[PDB]
Each structure stands twice: as C-alpha cells, then as structure tokens.
Amino acid sequence: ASNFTQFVLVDNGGTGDVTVAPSNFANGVAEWISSNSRSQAYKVTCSVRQSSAQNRKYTIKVEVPKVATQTVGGVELPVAAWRSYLNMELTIPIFATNSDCELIVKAMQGLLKDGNPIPSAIAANSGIY
Amino acid sequence: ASNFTQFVLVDNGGTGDVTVAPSNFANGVAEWISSNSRSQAYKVTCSVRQSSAQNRKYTIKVEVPKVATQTVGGVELPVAAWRSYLNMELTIPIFATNSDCELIVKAMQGLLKDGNPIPSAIAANSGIY
Amino acid sequence: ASNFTQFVLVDNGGTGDVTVAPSNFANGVAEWISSNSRSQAYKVTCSVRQSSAQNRKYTIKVEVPKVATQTVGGVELPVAAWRSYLNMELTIPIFATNSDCELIVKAMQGLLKDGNPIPSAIAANSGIY
Amino acid sequence: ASNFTQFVLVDNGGTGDVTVAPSNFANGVAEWISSNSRSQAYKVTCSVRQSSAQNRKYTIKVEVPKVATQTVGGVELPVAAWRSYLNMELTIPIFATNSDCELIVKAMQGLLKDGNPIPSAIAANSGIY
Amino acid sequence: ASNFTQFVLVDNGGTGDVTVAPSNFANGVAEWISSNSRSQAYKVTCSVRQSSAQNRKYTIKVEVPKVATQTVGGVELPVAAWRSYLNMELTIPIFATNSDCELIVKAMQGLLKDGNPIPSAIAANSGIY
Amino acid sequence: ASNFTQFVLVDNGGTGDVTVAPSNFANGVAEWISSNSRSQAYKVTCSVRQSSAQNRKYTIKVEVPKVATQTVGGVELPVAAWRSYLNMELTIPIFATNSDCELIVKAMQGLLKDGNPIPSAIAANSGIY
Numbered sequence: 001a002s003n004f005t006q007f008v009l010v011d012n013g014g015t016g017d018v019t020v021a022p023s024n025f026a027n028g029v030a031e032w033i034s035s036n037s038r039s040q041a042y043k044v045t046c047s048v049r050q051s052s053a054q055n056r057k058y059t060i061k062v063e064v065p066k067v068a069t070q071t072v073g074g075v076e077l078p079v080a081a082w083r084s085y086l087n088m089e090l091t092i093p094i095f096a097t098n099s100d101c102e103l104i105v106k107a108m109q110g111l112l113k114d115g116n117p118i119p120s121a122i123a124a125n126s127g128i129y
Numbered sequence: 130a131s132n133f134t135q136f137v138l139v140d141n142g143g144t145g146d147v148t149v150a151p152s153n154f155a156n157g158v159a160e161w162i163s164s165n166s167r168s169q170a171y172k173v174t175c176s177v178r179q180s181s182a183q184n185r186k187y188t189i190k191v192e193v194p195k196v197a198t199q200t201v202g203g204v205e206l207p208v209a210a211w212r213s214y215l216n217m218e219l220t221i222p223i224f225a226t227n228s229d230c231e232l233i234v235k236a237m238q239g240l241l242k243d244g245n246p247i248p249s250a251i252a253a254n255s256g257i258y
Numbered sequence: 259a260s261n262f263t264q265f266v267l268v269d270n271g272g273t274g275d276v277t278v279a280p281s282n283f284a285n286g287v288a289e290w291i292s293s294n295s296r297s298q299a300y301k302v303t304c305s306v307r308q309s310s311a312q313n314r315k316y317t318i319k320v321e322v323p324k325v326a327t328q329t330v331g332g333v334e335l336p337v338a339a340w341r342s343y344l345n346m347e348l349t350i351p352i353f354a355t356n357s358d359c360e361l362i363v364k365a366m367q368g369l370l371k372d373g374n375p376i377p378s379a380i381a382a383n384s385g386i387y
Numbered sequence: 388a389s390n391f392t393q394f395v396l397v398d399n400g401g402t403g404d405v406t407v408a409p410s411n412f413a414n415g416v417a418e419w420i421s422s423n424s425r426s427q428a429y430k431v432t433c434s435v436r437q438s439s440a441q442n443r444k445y446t447i448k449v450e451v452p453k454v455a456t457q458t459v460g461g462v463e464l465p466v467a468a469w470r471s472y473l474n475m476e477l478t479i480p481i482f483a484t485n486s487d488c489e490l491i492v493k494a495m496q497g498l499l500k501d502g503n504p505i506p507s508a509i510a511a512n513s514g515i516y
Numbered sequence: 517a518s519n520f521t522q523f524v525l526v527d528n529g530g531t532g533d534v535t536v537a538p539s540n541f542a543n544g545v546a547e548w549i550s551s552n553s554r555s556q557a558y559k560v561t562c563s564v565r566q567s568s569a570q571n572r573k574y575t576i577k578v579e580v581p582k583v584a585t586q587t588v589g590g591v592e593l594p595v596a597a598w599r600s601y602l603n604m605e606l607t608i609p610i611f612a613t614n615s616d617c618e619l620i621v622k623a624m625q626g627l628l629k630d631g632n633p634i635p636s637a638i639a640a641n642s643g644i645y
Numbered sequence: 646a647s648n649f650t651q652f653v654l655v656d657n658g659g660t661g662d663v664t665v666a667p668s669n670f671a672n673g674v675a676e677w678i679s680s681n682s683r684s685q686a687y688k689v690t691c692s693v694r695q696s697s698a699q700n701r702k703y704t705i706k707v708e709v710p711k712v713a714t715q716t717v718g719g720v721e722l723p724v725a726a727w728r729s730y731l732n733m734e735l736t737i738p739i740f741a742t743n744s745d746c747e748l749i750v751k752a753m754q755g756l757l758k759d760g761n762p763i764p765s766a767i768a769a770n771s772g773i774y
Contacts, residue, residue: 003246004257009239010232018236030257044240046247048256054209060247062240064233066224068591081591082224084233088217090251095210097197098254103139104193104213105241105248107147107171110138111191112238117132117159118175119234122187122219125227125551127177128132128159129521129538130522130537133516151259153514155286155305157520157541160514166455167314167512168352178540185554202455204353204468208311223554224593262515262774263517265503268493276494280517282772284544284563288515289774295613296572296770302498304505306514312467318505320498322491324482332715333726335611340482342491344498346475348509353468355455356512361397362451362471363499363506365405365429368396369449370496375390375417376433377496380445380477381489385435386390386417519762520773525755526748534752546762546773560756562763564772572770576763578756580749582741598740600749602756604733606767611727612711614769619655620709620729621757621768623663626654627689627707627731628754633648633675634691634705638735639750640743641701643693644649644675 004030009042009062020044037078040067055091062086133159138171149173166202168211169194184220191215262288267300267320278302295336298325313349320344391417396429407431424460426469427452442478449473520546525558525578536560553594556583571607578602649675654687654707665689682723685712700736707731 004025010018020042024031034042043063051057065080092101112119121128133154138161139147149171153160156176163171172192180186195211205211221233241248250257262283268276278300282289292300301321309315323338350359370377379386391412396419397405407429411418414434421429430450438444453469463469479491499506508515520541526534536548536558544565550558559579567573581596608620628635637644649670655663665677665687673694679687688708696702710725737749757764766773 002258003250003255005246007239007242007245010235011239012235025257042236044247046250046257048250052209058251060240062236064236066222066229070589070591072589076590079591081593082222084222084225084229085220086217086233086237087220088215090213090215092213092251093195093210096195096213096254098252100195100197100213101254102252103196104215105243105252106139106141107191107193108215109238109241109243109248110136110140111173111189112234112241114238116136117134118187118189119238120130121132121175121177122221123227123231123234124130124537125225125230125549125554125557126130126132126537127157127539127549128175129130129518151516152512153306154283154516155288155514157538157546160516162512164356165512166353166355166358168312170512176540178542179554200456202353202355202358204351204453204456204463206465206468224595225554226552226594260516260518261504261508261513263504265497265500267497268490269497270493279769280771280774281769282564283515283520283541283774284546284772289772291770293614293769295616296610299770300494302505304508304515306508310467316505316509318498320494322494324480324487332717332722333713333724335726336613337611340480342480342483342487343478344475344491344495345478346473348471348473350471350509351453351468354453354471354512356510358453358455358471359512360510361454362473363501363510364397364399365449365451366473367496367499367501367506368394368398369431369447370492370499372496374394375392376445376447377492378388379390379433379435380479381485381492382388383483383485383488384388384390385415386433387388518774519766519771521762523755523761524758526751527755528748528751534755541773544772558752560763562766562773564766574763574767576756578752580745580752582738582745598738600735600737600741600745602733602735602749602753604731606729606731608729608767608770609711609727612729612770616709616711616729617770618768619657620731621764622655622657623687623707623709624731625754625757625759625764626652626656626663627705628750628757629653630754632652633650634689634703635750635754637648637691637693638703638737639747641737641741641746642648643673644670644691645647 006032009034009044018042036067040065040078040080050094051091054094056094058090058092060086060088060090135161138163138173147171165194168205168208169199169201179223180220184222187217187219187221189215189217189219264290267292267302276300294325298323298336298338308352309349312352314352316348316350318344318346318348393419396421396431405429423452426463426466427457427459437481438478442480445475445477445479447473447475447477523548525550525560534558555593555595556581567607570609570611572610574604574606574608576602576604576606652677654679654689663687684722684724685710696736699738699740701739703733703735703737705731705733705735 006021008019020032032044064084068081070079135150138149149161152162158176161173264279266277278290290302322342326339328337393408407419410420416434419431522537539549545563584597586595651666668678674692713726715724
C-alpha cells in the first residue's frame with residue numbers, strides 16, 4: 001500500500017480515458033499530471049495540514065485544459081486555450097472516526113452522481129431552479 | 130429542467146440512505162437539508178455567478194455531522210468537534226461549451242470514485258504515502 | 259414542493275376572503291401581496307438569517323390596510339387611510355429538532371386561537387385584566 | 388371581561404396539552420407560565436401602550452423550551468441552546484374600530500394556520516423555496 | 517410558486533428555439549442565460565425597485581449575440597462577434613391596480629406585435645418613414 | 646410605402662381597443678397619440694440615430710394614462726390621474742443583417758409574451774420570486 005498511485009480522472013469508457021499519474025511530492029503536495037506536455041496537462045494536487053488544533057484540512061485542486069495549438073512567431077506550440085479550475089477545501093474535526101470520514105466521502109460522491117441537481121446544472125451551463 | 134429537488138446524498142444502499150431536500154432559496158442560493166436539527170443536519174448549498182469577465186464560479190458547500198457517539202436531537206458542543214465542512218469552488222471559463230462542462234463533471238466524479246487515492250486517503254484518516 | 263405559495267390571510271368564510279400571493283423574493287425576502295394596487299394591498303414578508311452562530315432568526319411582517327379613496331388635486335386616488343403593522347421576530351437555537359420546531363408553531367397558533375386571552379383583548383380594544 | 392386566565396398554549400389534543408397560567412402582573416405586564424422550572428417553562432407575556440400619538444402597540448413575547456433530549460428539572464446550559472424566543476409587536480392606529488381589530492386578529496391567525504407556508508417552513512427547519 | 521424559471525426567449529419555429537434558464541439572483545437582480553458557452557449566450561436580467569415614494573421601476577435588459585468563432589494564432593474560441601443590447605425601464609405609480617398593470621403589459625406587447633410600425637422598422641434596419 | 650401610420654396599441658378584445666394615430670414627426674421623432682383629449686391620451690414615440698460609428702440606437706417611449714376627471718372649484722376637466730412610462734433603448738451594431746434584426750425582434754416579443762416571467766410579474770404588481 002502507498003496510496004500515491006495513478007488513476008483515471010475522466011472515464012470516457014475505455015477510449016480516450018484521461019488518466020493521471022504521480023508526478024511530484026515536493027513540499028508535501030502530492031501532484032498527479034496526465035501524460036502530456038506540461039503546457040497541456042490535466043493536473044491534480046492534494047495536501048492535508050492540521051489547520052487548527054482540532055481540525056485537519058485537505059486542499060484538493062484539479063485543472064482541466066482545453067487544448068489547442070497556437071502559432072507564436074510563425075512556430076506552432078502545444079498550448080491550452082483555457083483551463084478550468086476546481087478548488088476544494090475539506091475541514092474535518094480530529095474527533096472523526098474512519099466511519100465518520102467514510103460518510104464524508106459518500107456524501108461527496110453522491111453530490112456529483114449523474115442525474116443529481118448539481119452535476120446537471122454544471123453540465124448544462126445552467127443555475128439551479 | 131428544474132434542478133431543485135430532493136436527492137440522495139448518502140446512499141447506504143436503500144436502507145439508511147440520507148436524502149437531502151430543498152429548504153431555502155434566499156438570494157438564489159439553493160439550500161438542501163436533511164431531516165434533522167440544524168446542528169446535526171447534512172446540509173448542501175450551491176450558487177453560480179460570473180466571477181470575472183472571463184470566468185464563472187460555482188460555489189458548493191457541504192456540512193456533514195460527526196455521527197459516531199452522536200446523541201440524536203441532543204445539544205452537542207463544541208460545534209466544531211461535531212461537524213466537517215466541505216467547500217468547493219469550480220471556476221469554468223466562459224468559453225466552455227456544455228460538452229466541456231460534461232467533462233469537468235466527469236473529472237470531478239473520477240477524483241472521488243471508490244478506490245481512487247483521494248477518497249481512500251480521506252476515509253482512512255490518512256494523507257498520501 | 260416549493261413552499262412559496264399563495265394562501266388566504268383573512269378567512270371571511272369563502273366570501274371576501276383576503277388571499278395573498280407570491281410577489282417578490284429580491285434580496286432574500288419572500289413577499290406576498292393581495293391582489294390590489296400596491297397602495298391598498300395587504301403585504302406579508304418573511305426572511306430567515308443565521309443571527310448568531312447558534313441561532314436562526316425568522317422575521318415576519320404583515321401590513322393590514324384600511325382602504326379609502328382620497329381626492330388629491332380634484333382627482334380620486336385609491337389609498338390606504340392607515341395600516342396596521344404586525345412585526346414578529348422568532349429566534350430558534352440550531353439544536354432544535356423539527357419536532358421542537360413544531361412545538362413552536364403549535365404554541366404560536368394556540369396563542370391566537372379564538373377565545374384565548376390575547377386575541378380577545380386585541381379584538382376588544384382592551385388590555386388584559 | 389377579565390382576560391387574564393389560564394389557557395392551552397400547545398394543544399396536543401387533550402392528552403399532553405400545555406396549559407399556561409397567570410403568574411405575574413407587575414407593571415401591568417400579564418405573564419403566564421407553565422408548570423415547570425423557570426428555565427424549562429413555556430412563558431407568555433403581553434402588554435399594550437400608546438406608542439405614538441397615532442398608534443398603540445401590543446408587545447407579546449413567548450419563550451418555548453427545546454424539548455428533545457430535555458432532562459426535566461435538570462440544569463441545562465447554555466440557556467441559549469435550550470430556548471426559542473418569539474417577539475411580536477403589533478402596531479394598530481388609534482382609528483381602528485373593534486371590527487378592524489377583529490380582522491387584524493384573523494390576519495394573524497391566517498398567517499399561522501397549518502398548511503400555510505410560514506408555519507410549515509418553521510416546522511420543517513426551512514426557509515422559503 | 518416561482519416565476520424565476522426557464523422560458524423561451526425566441527420561438528424560432530419549435531426547434532431552433534432559444535431558451536433562457538435561471539442563472540443568478542444576487543442583489544435583487546434576476547438573471548437568465550441560455551445554454552452552452554457563456555461567451556455566446558443570450559442574457560436577460562430584471563430587477564424592480566421603488567424609485568420614488570410613488571413609483572416602482574422595473575429595469576429589464578436583454579443581450580442578443582451574433583455567434584462566431586474567433587481564431588487567433590490557430591487557437592479557435594467560440595465568441596459572440598457582437599451583441600445587440602435592449603435595455604428598458606418601466607415606471608409604474610403605486611396606485612396601479614392589477615388591471616392597470618395588465619393594460620400596461622398589453623400596450624407593451626401591442627407595441628411590438630408583428631406587423632406594427634416599430635417591430636417592422638427594426639426588423640428591416642429602418643427608421644420611420 | 647409608409648410605416649408612420651395608425652396602429653393598435655392595446656387589442657383589448659376587438660372593441661375597447663386602443664389605437665394610436667400619427668401626430669407629429671418633427672426632428673426625427675415620430676410621435677403617435679390616441680384620440681380624444683390629449684390630456685387622457687396614450688402616446689408612443691420612436692427615433693433612431695447612429696449612436697456611435699458602429700451603432701444605431703432606437704429610443705422608443707410609451708405613456709399609459711389612468712383616465713380620470715379632475716374637479717376643482719366645480720369645474721371638471723378630463724385628466725390623466727397618473728401615467729406609467731415605458732422607455733426603451735435598443736442598440737444594434739451596423740453589421741446586423743436584416744435576419745439578425747428579425748431575431749432581435751423575436752427576442753423582444755418573446756420577453757413580453759403572455760405567460761413568461763417578466764410580463765406576468767408586471768401584470769401582478771410583482772417582482773421575481
């Protein structure tokens with residue numbers, strides 16, 4: 001066991017799956033990037049710090065690039081036309097059991113399950129109503 | 130559409146599921162709450178605004194009760210020993226089409242799928258190693 | 259479900275019932291007015307805010323108009339000769355269960371039930387003695 | 388008349404009713420209390436004065452005990468975790484006849500009838516949505 | 517009850533219809549935006565405020581994009597080549613009853629009815645002649 | 646060919662219809678006024694001008710009178726008790742073809758179509774909720 005492993009970030013059903021792999025842990029920040037140039041890569045980072053005396057805080061970030069090829073100076077360079085940024089902070093009391101922590105993980109994945117309100121809104125460029 | 134409905138936040142497989150239902154919409158912030166006192170409820174909120182000239186941000190917040198040794202309906206203090214707080218900010222460039230937003234949603238749910246490192250670190254009360 | 263619906267404010271037994279309907283939610287204040295001109299309308303507003311860390315506070319207001327028709331500049335305008343103002347603030351601890359909250363609602367309606375002391379005093383232009 | 392009598396504040400239909408009885412009249416403020424320690428009692432007070440040259444105000448206050456997980460007769464601290472506070476101010480113009488005051492009472496009890504939005508938001512621990 | 521919902525801004529047949537869905541209601545400004553890239557989206561906002569003691573004033577705004585692709589350096593972005601901007605202010609005295617408001621609405625829709633002088637001048641890049 | 650003609654501003658059935666007829670076109674401002682006393686008349690004006698190098702800007706204005714009789718000193722005059730004032734500005738870039746102008750017109754009439762949120766909020770003395 002070492003949980004610092006590769007995983008598939010975007011499952012496009014076997015074909016065109018975006019999978020991300022361990023790439024750095026300098027300064028206590030675990031980083032995973034996809035197999036692209038650093039200019040076009042998906043990136044995921046994660047770090048935990050004991051924020052208060054009684055809390056721990058996980059900070060997770062995801063960058064999703066829209067790839068493009070730009071001509072700069074008559075030369076074509078692999079580029080990301082824009083990136084989208086997910087940025088999440090989770091603060092957990094030190095008194096939380098592993099069963100308490102599993103509840104948090106289940107709530108977070110239920111939140112984004114296909115068909116529930118929030119994933120639907122995002123995917124439609126809509127708000128909730 | 131009409132996104133603002135009840136949904137299952139914690140799926141304990143039919144029996145013991147936690148459903149969260151619409152409870153407030155003041156200021157266009159959708160709130161969903163479970164059937165509990167506000168000090169012990171699972172609570173979810175979501176809102177979207179154009180954050181910059183180039184971006185929109187979804188701000189999503191979740192609060193999850195510490196359940197081990199909980200006294201249902203009891204007054205449990207300090208509040209911070211009994212609650213976890215999730216805070217997600219998703220910044221999406223105004224150029225993202227709906228297909229782009231679909232992919233961002235898939236990246237978000239891939240991050241948290243069971244078995245992948247981030248959910249299993251959280252649930253095991255661990256960092257990355 | 260959306261609890262922002264129309265309701266009858268004054269039940270004059272089917273005939274001359276004053277009924278009030280959703281009319282605004284700007285700035286998180288739900289407003290209902292009766293079907294009159296804005297100068298002669300009954301108005302009801304309601305808002306909830308988390309006042310303390312451990313409290314929530316509902317602020318409810320009702321305006322009851324005494325309608326009249328005034329001649330201003332030789333022209334007759336629909337007007338309210340005076341309004342009566344109910345103004346109520348309810349502070350509930352976050353530790354209150356929904357069964358605890360039902361008790362509050364039952365106490366508030368028992369307070370104003372026909373025949374109990376306070377409704378009788380108001381209706382008679384009397385104090386309590 | 389003689390308004391100042393006992394009445395049923397919470398009608399749980401015959402069995403489990405909460406009756407509140409006259410308990411103080413210092414300064415012409417009528418107080419009614421239930422049969423409990425003053426820290427756990429249902430308490431009601433009511434007074435009236437001419438607030439301005441044109442208006443009278445009834446000030447009515449209610450305190451309701453948090454009952455889930457209550458220890459009867461116990462010392463429960465903090466007080467604020469265990470109590471809800473209602474505060475109503477009714478301003479009625481000096482022109483209002485008794486019929487006018489009857490209607491104001493009906494508006495007040497319509498606001499709180501079961502099924503109408505404000506009582507059902509409160510009881511469900513919710514805002515308007 | 518809610519009027520902050522999705523609606524059809526352009527029935528352009530029953531297929532190329534443009535629909536606008538609720539996006540944000542911050543600060544008393546209801547905003548609706550069509551789906552796909554915010555950069556090519558239609559936008560509608562509406563807010564109402566008491567402009568004077570006697571008047572309420574609605575401000576409604578609509579933006580109609582000309583959809584296009586910007587290509588710079590080989591990178592293509594979905595953009596709006598330009599936007600037409602409708603901006604309207606409707607002032608209504610508080611003495612207007614609901615019937616007077618209905619009439620104001622019929623005047624507005626008569627003004628823009630198909631075949632009448634103003635809609636057909638606009639539709640033809642033309643003035644009055 | 647002429648679009649400066651009489652037209653129906655309010656089809657209020659096929660009988661109480663309000664028609665506005667050309668009155669004056671001085672200084673590039675087309676004005677139409679309904680018949681009988683100018684004091685109780687509906688008024689519509691429209692003017693178009695090149696607001697910038699790239700834009701033309703239409704200014705359309707409508708006034709809706711509340712008909713009434715002023716009686717002062719026993720002398721009665723037909724007056725408007727008050728007027729609602731619609732004022733709209735539509736900016737269109739010179740690149741819009743006639744088809745783009747048709748679409749702008751369909752957006753305008755969709756906005757005010759019967760049953761959609763803005764016309765029905767106005768019609769009911771209401772905001773968005």
